[PDB]
Design a protein around this ligand. Structure first.
Ligand SMILES: O=P(O)(O)OC[C@H]1O[C@H](OP(=O)(O)OP(=O)(O)O)[C@H](O)[C@@H]1O
Ligand SMILES: O=P(O)(O)OC[C@H]1O[C@H](OP(=O)(O)OP(=O)(O)O)[C@H](O)[C@@H]1O
Ligand SMILES: [Mn+2]
Ligand SMILES: [Mn+2]
Ligand SMILES: [Mn+2]
Ligand SMILES: [Mn+2]
Lengths: 343, 341
């Protein structure tokens, strides 16, 4: 009952998992008036969301999602929220990872005029209209697929207006990487705030991954830090392992954030492609350190340095892989224009 | 400050200044803010816990946008509601006694029996425009000032309030926002916890004497069964007072006798009490009146107030009759009196 839940939230009592899941389902289904949805989303944030509430909302979104089944896939995706406007590094990293493992990403086009994963993929020529059966086929043939939230999380449209009108960030903004509709059992999860590492790692531990690594990077980004320390949690059935890593532990000097910042999807696309051509080493290094940790989550390397070395071999083959991905699901002529502009 | 910065502020648990809260209330009450954002703000205020400055600013905002008549020498006896007990409309009954000895300016909305509802069952015309309102106070020493007429801007938040279905800041401001600006006030509060908070707010809201009262077991009235905690507020400051029901020279009143299931049932119980046919309802009315009398400095103490309330209650049905005949339908009152006899 929406009314007692709200009173409970107002009193700063944490919800149980099933309480939270039913709450999320009613909201996502559009069964709850906008006024009460706004009330609930604000109350959750001001109370401070608990593990049980994160797990419940995650399971609700997964259950209401349109699904495919690629449990052996990896995803590398973040919560967003840092807003530094840096290159779409997880998208580039997915391309390296697809050479050696199935990859399934998901998400939305960004608001204008930001650059999300969907937008950089589209600038590269990718067709984000991918029905489930096609998605299955695409992953089999090319080890990569992008699953648009519009199609795979279609019920999220029912909370869109409250979310937009509120402006502020809510529980929904930290659920993205925990709600992969391909059921990817391996996950590199970026989190924008150091204070959310603990909540989300503990939540992740009950969301049934084989291995999920949560990363927060200085100066405040949902990625492996190119400037300094990365604070990470390694979650498995064995438990949660604390890890602190500096960029120097990859064998490289700190990358200046200036070099990673982008001003459009195309610019992000150009940066990525130049890194694949060996013409932008700062972005390549950023891509590679993020891939290195993803490789570690897959249990393909024994440490992060080896992952970084191994990513170097993958980046050299990535433009060719990008071409095969886009030729199978997209317009190769858009990739070639980006390549010309990258040369 | 625009609305989105205000919400940011409230989500970060920063208290608003009086003037900020007042300008925030005005925007909300004028209908300038989307319902989703009004919902968010009211919830954040409650999550944060509203401060004195916020209470004062919101109240002043309502006062500003109210339609005003001038009757400060009037007394009001009114509560915030809440607590879950569906009791007889005791402050409205008390108003009828008090109108014998002082002008009374009641105000509020329909609820399932609020003050407006009982009055209408008795036959009162609850919509009284300003000019004739002052007229009826002059003539009968009593008027009810409907929030629908006198707080029209509040129509802009009625939906959000009802849809939220939880108490908000607006639910503690009713007795602080009389459109006639009565300088003497008995203010009911349903929780001990807000007594200090509301009394400190009231102290900055320019009453000559406002008495705030919380009654066990958890109602916005003088306690019929036990202890009443109260704050006497004036220019002199805030005075603490503890008062058992035995201090009125009576025993505990069985709570069940005070509970009501319709507006007509509240009306019958009140009339019966005036006829001397429901002594428990009578006692409930009288202990609350006693405290009103004390606010008006009509009595030296609450025992004296109670005793004098008994004199007043014997004239109250005839007073009720003159009030309703001057503004409403007496044939409804008589139908109730027949149900009561
Ligand atoms: O704002 P939202 O739509 O909720 O999305 C949150 C973030 O998730 C995506 O990152 P992802 O890690 O998937 O890709 P990227 O690192 O390549 O941008 C995205 O591009 C945003 O940065
Ligand atoms: O729910 P709301 O509309 O905001 O009203 C709150 C209370 O204010 C009125 O009491 P009042 O003290 O004026 O009369 P009573 O104590 O005689 O009922 C009313 O009947 C409610 O109990
Ligand atoms: Mn990312
Ligand atoms: Mn990022
Ligand atoms: Mn009352
Ligand atoms: Mn009451």
């Amino acid at each position: 009952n929406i009314n007692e839940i709200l009173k409970k939230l107002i009193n700063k009592s944490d919800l149980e998992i099933n309480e939270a899941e039913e709450l999320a389902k009613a909201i996502i289904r559009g069964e709850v008036p906008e006024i009460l949805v706004s009330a609930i989303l604000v109350a959750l944030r001001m109370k401070g969301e608990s593990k049980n509430e994160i797990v419940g909302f995650a399971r609700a979104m997964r259950e209401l999602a349109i699904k495919i089944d690629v449990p052996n896939a990896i995803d590398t995706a973040g919560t967003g929220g840092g807003g530094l406007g840096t290159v779409n590094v997880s998208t580039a990293s997915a391309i390296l990872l697809s050479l050696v493992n199935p990859v399934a990403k998901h998400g939305n086009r960004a608001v204008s005029g930001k650059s999300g994963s969907a937008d950089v993929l589209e600038a590269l020529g990718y067709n984000i209209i991918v029905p489930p059966e096609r998605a299955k086929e695409l992953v089999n043939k090319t080890n990569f697929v992008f699953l648009s939230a519009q199609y795979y999380h279609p019920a999220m449209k029912n909370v869109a207006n409250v979310r937009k009108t509120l402006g502020i960030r809510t529980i929904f903004n930290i659920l993205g990487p925990l709600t992969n509709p391909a059921n990817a059992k391996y996950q590199l999860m970026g989190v924008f705030s150091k204070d959310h590492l603990d909540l989300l790692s503990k939540s992740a531990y009950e969301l049934d991954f084989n291995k999920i690594i949560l990363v927060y990077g200085e100066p405040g980004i949902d990625e492996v830090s190119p400037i300094g320390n990365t604070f990470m949690k390694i979650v498995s059935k064995r438990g949660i392992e604390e890890v602190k890593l500096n960029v120097t532990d990859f064998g490289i000097s700190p990358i200046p954030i200036e070099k990673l910042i982008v001003n459009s999807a195309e610019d992000s696309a150009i940066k990525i492609v130049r890194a694949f051509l060996g013409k932008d080493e700062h972005v390549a290094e950023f891509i590679k350190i993020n891939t290195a940790v993803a490789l570690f989550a897959l249990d393909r390397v024994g440490d992060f340095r080896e992952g970084y070395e191994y990513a170097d071999h993958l980046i050299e083959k990535s433009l060719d892989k990008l071409n095969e991905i886009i030729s199978m699901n997209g317009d190769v002529t858009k990739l070639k224009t980006i390549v010309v502009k990258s040369s």
